[PDB]
User: What shape does this take?
Amino acid sequence: HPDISVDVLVIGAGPTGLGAAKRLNQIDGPSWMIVDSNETPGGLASTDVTPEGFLYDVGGHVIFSHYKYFDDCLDEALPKEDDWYTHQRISYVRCQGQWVPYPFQNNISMLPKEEQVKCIDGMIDAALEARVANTKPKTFDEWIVRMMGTGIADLFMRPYNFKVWAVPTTKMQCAWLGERVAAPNLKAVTTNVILGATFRFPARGGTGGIWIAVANTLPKEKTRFGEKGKVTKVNANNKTVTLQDGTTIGYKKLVSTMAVDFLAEAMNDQELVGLTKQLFYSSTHVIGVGVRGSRPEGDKCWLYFPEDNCPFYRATIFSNYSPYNQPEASAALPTMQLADGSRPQSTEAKEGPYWSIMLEVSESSMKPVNQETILADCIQGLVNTEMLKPTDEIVSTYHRRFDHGYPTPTLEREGTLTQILPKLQDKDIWSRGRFGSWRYEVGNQDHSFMLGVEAVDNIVNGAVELTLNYPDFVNGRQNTERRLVDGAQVFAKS
Amino acid sequence: HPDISVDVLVIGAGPTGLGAAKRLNQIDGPSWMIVDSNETPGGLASTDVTPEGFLYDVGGHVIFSHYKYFDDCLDEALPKEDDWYTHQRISYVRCQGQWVPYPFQNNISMLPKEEQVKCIDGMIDAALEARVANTKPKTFDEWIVRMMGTGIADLFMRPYNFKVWAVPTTKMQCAWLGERVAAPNLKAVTTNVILGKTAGNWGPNATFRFPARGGTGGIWIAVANTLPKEKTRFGEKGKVTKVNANNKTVTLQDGTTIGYKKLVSTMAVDFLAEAMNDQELVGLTKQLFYSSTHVIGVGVRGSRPERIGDKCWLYFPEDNCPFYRATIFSNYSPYNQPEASAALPTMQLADGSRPQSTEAKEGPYWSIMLEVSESSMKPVNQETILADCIQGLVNTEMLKPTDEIVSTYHRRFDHGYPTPTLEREGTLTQILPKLQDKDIWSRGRFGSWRYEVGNQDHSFMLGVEAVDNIVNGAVELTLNYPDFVNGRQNTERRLVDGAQVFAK
Amino acid sequence: PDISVDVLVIGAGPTGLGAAKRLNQIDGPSWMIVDSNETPGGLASTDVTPEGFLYDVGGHVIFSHYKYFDDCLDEALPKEDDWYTHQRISYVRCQGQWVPYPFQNNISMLPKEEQVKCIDGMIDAALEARVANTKPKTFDEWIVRMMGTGIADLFMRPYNFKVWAVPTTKMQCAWLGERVAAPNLKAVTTNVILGKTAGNWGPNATFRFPARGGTGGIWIAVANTLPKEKTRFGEKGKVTKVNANNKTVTLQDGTTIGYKKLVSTMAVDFLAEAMNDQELVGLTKQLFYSSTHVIGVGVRGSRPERIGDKCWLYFPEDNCPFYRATIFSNYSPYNQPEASAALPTMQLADGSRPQSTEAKEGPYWSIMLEVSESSMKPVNQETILADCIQGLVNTEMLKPTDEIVSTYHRRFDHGYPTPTLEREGTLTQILPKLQDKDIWSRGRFGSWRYEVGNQDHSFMLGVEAVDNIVNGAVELTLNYPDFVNGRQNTERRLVDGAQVFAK
Amino acid sequence: HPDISVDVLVIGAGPTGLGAAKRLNQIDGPSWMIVDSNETPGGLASTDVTPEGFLYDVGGHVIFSHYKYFDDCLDEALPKEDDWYTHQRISYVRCQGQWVPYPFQNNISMLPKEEQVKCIDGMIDAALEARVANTKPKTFDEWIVRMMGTGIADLFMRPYNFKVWAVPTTKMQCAWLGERVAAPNLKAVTTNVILGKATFRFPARGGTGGIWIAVANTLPKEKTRFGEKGKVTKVNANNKTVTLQDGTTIGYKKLVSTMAVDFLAEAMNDQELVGLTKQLFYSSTHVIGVGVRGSRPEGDKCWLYFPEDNCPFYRATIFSNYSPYNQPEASAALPTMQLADGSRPQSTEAKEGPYWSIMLEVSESSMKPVNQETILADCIQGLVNTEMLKPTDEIVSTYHRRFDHGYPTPTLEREGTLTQILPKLQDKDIWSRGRFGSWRYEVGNQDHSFMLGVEAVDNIVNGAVELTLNYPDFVNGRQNTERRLVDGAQVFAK
Ligand SMILES: Cc1cc2nc3c(=O)[nH]c(=O)nc-3n(C[C@H](O)[C@H](O)[C@H](O)COP(=O)(O)OP(=O)(O)OC[C@H]3O[C@@H](n4cnc5c(N)ncnc54)[C@H](O)[C@@H]3O)c2cc1C
Assistant: This one.
């Protein structure tokens, strides 16, 4: 008879685990507890702050929500209108001196006329092949070429995805992209050549403020965050998890949102360790740069970088998302360096206003990253891409490296996962999440939050885990049926 | 305030309604009651019996379950191994004097060689067209021709489906058939022709189970028994006459008023519109097309003839018999007809003539069930259909002229098939959201009018998922994504979920 | 009978002169060539206005498929100053623009919204071509498969109706060649993206045109090389009866000519009437043809910068009755009077009277128009000249103020033999019947096949007919136009081995 | 001033040269002479006879004539109805104990059912690919597969053509087969499977070589020079002078050379042409004749094809069916030389007949050597293996001759080489034409070859297009009725 006993134990309090917790706390049936080694909920969707006052999200922001359930939980956490800012859902690709709007292929009119020809010629090839295709694409690279043609593949999606995933497009599967047939809309691309939706963001606290607020709604006594909640052993057969302080938790069902390879190690289950080690992943460097001045003459989006004049694959003007992402203009800060690398003339603390850039650089066994120099190379890439002038004054830098950044959709991934996840299922273990179940396409915040919700919904109410197994299905519909108040709660308060 | 008040009211105790009730009784959260105008549970899945002792179900589509939850409800209702019999899925198409194993195209080797050429030539055209196809078929007929080619479509699926739906294949949609691409397996069809082979899509893995006693209606009697009796109201006392959508009240024949917070109505949606005195819905429901179905049962004296054998359902595209499908109902269970020692007089011979003797002789007996469909595009003479069917049994060589008939059965069901017309979804996407906005889950074979989810396992789950949506926010998968549920193993919803284990 | 020869040739247009050049080369069997016209060249002749302006019957310049044709022209006009060389410069007049030919490669000149419609149609065409497994059955189908709907509607469809005076749906398409009917989508979209214009001419895309006499000067020169005594042109050479069974032709003056083989280049419907063969007449009357109006306009002034080096122009739009126009004054400076020649202005292009009736000097330039007429598309003979001149103002070829000093209008009853769907069905009944009576009916209207009806093909029709009559040669041009067009026909020369070995 | 002077000199009196001679003699214009090293005209279309009285053609027989001109010359040469026999145009393929009528694919119902399945399945694959084909086949093997599919290719056309050409189907071009699109008639092949379901004339006497002796009789004797007196040893292209073995020098104005073009290059001492001709590939051919005692075994007057590898020959014919004058009459007495199984006969005595006769062809090349010392025996064994001879049949005559230049190989390289050779010879006023004069097998049978010489003369004199040489597809697809042995030119001269 161990130290604590619960029906469902939730390991991890990132969006996946908090999803499971929100649903367990709504159903309010089986007993439950959620643990996390971090004192602050949010996992990799947390927000850091530099000593100089600049916020940087670790794990991006949602630009589209697929579930009314997710929406209800956000509204509960942040219910006032000035808890949120609304911006347009846009993005750009940096290509040959130009900021090319999304979607790239629909905007190549911005590139030189000679290069437009190369693109259309490639897409005509693709359109003609698609017309007699009778097989589905087998690799990511095949999917790209069949969709965009050689010309448009080489300018953007091919070189870009190598910088993101640190594997060639030929070594990745493509089912994760959807069931949309891989063929081009040739008429759309040429018509635009010839002729020449919002998201909400937290006003305060960055993205990680959402998850603090969502977690606040949980009963504190059913949570255990910090060093007291680090899981060190998992005894699958005794249904016992052991914590670092020696506390033992017994469960009837386990929702594990830690990385499945870490789970395999904590089970001292060498069969699973062997299998998990077959999974490929890339590590992520998040770099933040705080700059003195006003914003460069734009809007609140992500920027993509296929070219090899900067080490990062994506950048954002994080200061455009919210004015509380960086210090107020009256705050005094010394200039740390110039964008060109030189030391400033004066050690004087001057006022702002300030703006802020965030970068991501990926690292893997096939793509090393010089930890000692990457910050400077990024800042240089910011000068090369004309995001920073050589003379801009940098007042804050941020650089953190996350070992498990992206779960890589390799060709082998599904083969390995259908050996890992059913084995854990048979031991009554729902290993779910960005790295709990290792599927990038459902690894952003709304899908992940719902992986936890649906996992609990499967454990209690016999629901199909739709997001886990049918991302295509959930992405192609309005998910309105599951709500933070279902009929069950309405009929019980009578 | 009204006479009775419940959270979820279920109108109708056919499989859909029993599904809704089975899940309400499992969850055991919100209060509920289920009503029906018939004293016997099962709706149109009931079983009739002739005065002579022959059982007849309402149709010849046996049960195939897509859901572990359906299995659990059956296993609970009839748990002993000898409550069920297991048979192989054996069916044939009757074509040009031959019983052609199903699927038809895999067995055209039984037809004349000149006809084999026309069939293969048609399927070659279809395969070549399939190779450069870039559109979906828009009509049921296009789907058939793309699947089989002209020759094979004309021998079976075209003439047969007219006899089934009583509308032409060109006036029906085809999404209800699935997302499988409409293309032929030319190599399979030519290979069997070359080898001269026949082969059916059955074998020991391809089975179905049938209730040992009571026919199909016995399943639903057993399922309904598992409900708490006090939460039911069946018979004349449970006939619904008014449904006041805005006051959320249903009124019964005897004047009892039931107040509901949410309503699961499994009656035919056109009658529901009448019972709401809602002239907008009545106009819309009157746009829905449906066919009426005649069930004919014929009881025959003798041991089972070799020409019949272990056959189960039979398909009839040709115009020498009024029925589209026949069933050897006596093969499904020995309790579907009287025992051999039972004595019965011969009523007539298959050719219509009087029997030599009016005295009752012993059996054994066997039993055939026929289905005939009727519509404004294909009328049916109620006064003669029984005799024309019996003649059709002779024309198709199911009965010899001298076979002795000891029992006949004929019932006509006004709402038989909800027709998958081209117009159906356009009308249905106007009707269902309106009923949903009034908190009405109109579900079922005619509650939601979608044939492809209107047999027993789908319909049972329509009610289960409708409740699951009302209480637990589950997606109504069977209602809106039939292709999705049919193409997967639905093992997650079970009659004992975590919720019930954690409460005990 | 009065005269007897082995091979008689009726007509001295290009086909018959071809027959004669080869008969005169072989110099074996006896022969004579007759024509009702005193001037050789038939309908490839050249007219001249009283004011000194030359006008040909057409706007299709000469492109030779045969070294043999080349040898015969060179013999007739051998000095370098007998010919002028120009680049093949042509445009389509469409929506205020002179669009370089080929039309589809230049739609960048049209409004963008219209470019989108054209490219969208051609994408549809390219994708259908990718899975096509039938040949086009009609001219219209061939156009659409080549261009898509948009580009077909802007040019080839409306234009060919003005040309043939029947719809593109009523015409066959085998005569255009065996080139598969599919679009060059990359070429068309590349030019749209680049904003490029590009015509199908250059330094080596040329044609040569006679310095003097117009086109009809070639055939005068060619005919001169024949033995005069073996020709009989004028009223003395009009054929009125043809007795196929006695192999006798009767002339207007009553001379009876007996032949062993006959090469007839008169219109086959006229031949059938002249044979008093009611079976052939019935069949020939099944053949469709359009009549062609030629209008010539002589203009005062130096060549306008807007006209430039243009040669032929195509007119699909319905603001002018003509389908084609030619800057005939660019082909040769001797096609119109010299600058010192004085001519009064007859009218202004807008129809108004000139200020002065006095004769002023030039220089001059010259336009030739072609308008077609048929039972499905009539032509008001009394007004077509004015309507043409109005069409010159509408198409911005003439300013309202331009001074017209000469006009020409002639109407040729047999203008184009129409490639109808019915043509081969009827022709494969006519030609074998005439062949069985030893009659080689050949030519633009002798054999009625438009695609071998311009000057080089017709010339060779007569050459090959003689070569078939004498040497067993295959009549390749007659029955396999595609074959001769796709190759260099270098084997037959004006001096073969036979003539080298005999001298 | 050389020994003789002619306008057109014709080297060779096989069918091509005789064609050249017949037309020159018809035109009767330029002077001319024809020479041949053999005293008997006919070249490799000649007929040999064994000491025992059995005739064997070397170079087969024409089964279809494409030209009324060819017909006119045969009718002139052999004008009586009893100079010819008429037989039906048919052939069979020997495949797995069966004689499968031509065309093979239309008769696969004779094979075991499972093999019909493999054939139809392969042809279904070809039918579906042809539906989206947009390229022409580049190799013979590609042409076969696209036409017949894998199953039927492997049973007949693939192994058979290796035995014929003695090079693989992958190393040969396919333009020589015609311009008929390479696609299967799937309905015809399956219809015959489901249902279970045109003459030539042959010389009465002298075998095929009698045609050419008779044709050669029509030339003026003084204008011919056959035998050792007419062997050409030197060809001086620049002096337009040919020198013979007896030292006679012939001056020409135009030269029609029908000897093998590689031999022509040697005789010109032209190392540029020698190098070029040596690039051309050819196979050597063994003709084997077997004379048998007995009546004909249970019969049609055709060729038999042998794709299987239980006999070394690729085709065989019952030559005794073509004419009773191809073998001795029954009253002639001949000893048995051997039995078909190889053993010595019981009796050495000369017995009466009747007799019948088999002819075989075996191909040899650098890629497929042949044992000269055993090939006759191996052939006789192959006749037993294919049940054409019973082990006990009595063989009374054997014939074995090897022709070094047998077939000009339609290799992938051939047209590249030929368009370097034929223009060089054309520029020296040399019309090199024929089976080996111009090396194009598809016009190397008797009627095409005869016309190559006719058309070459017709080009030299009358400016006619050499249609057969350059456009085999064109002439094969039409009735060539225009050129006749009496043209208008001769009619108008009398
Ligand atoms: C309107 C028109 C426009 C053309 N435009 C072009 C062009 O742009 N480019 C081009 O290359 N070609 C053009 N041609 C065709 C060109 O002229 C041909 O080379 C030629 O006309 C066709 O050859 P032919 O010899 O059959 O022609 P024809 O000129 O028809 O020759 C027939 C001759 O026979 C004579 N004849 C007829 N009946 C009798 C009789 N009963 N007795 C005696 N003699 C008789 C005629 O008078 C005439 O001289 C055009 C033709 C026409 C009609």
Remarks:
- Chain D has one domain: 7-494.
- The longest helix of chain D spans residues 140-165.
- The CA atoms of residues 144 and 153 of chain D lie 6 Å apart.
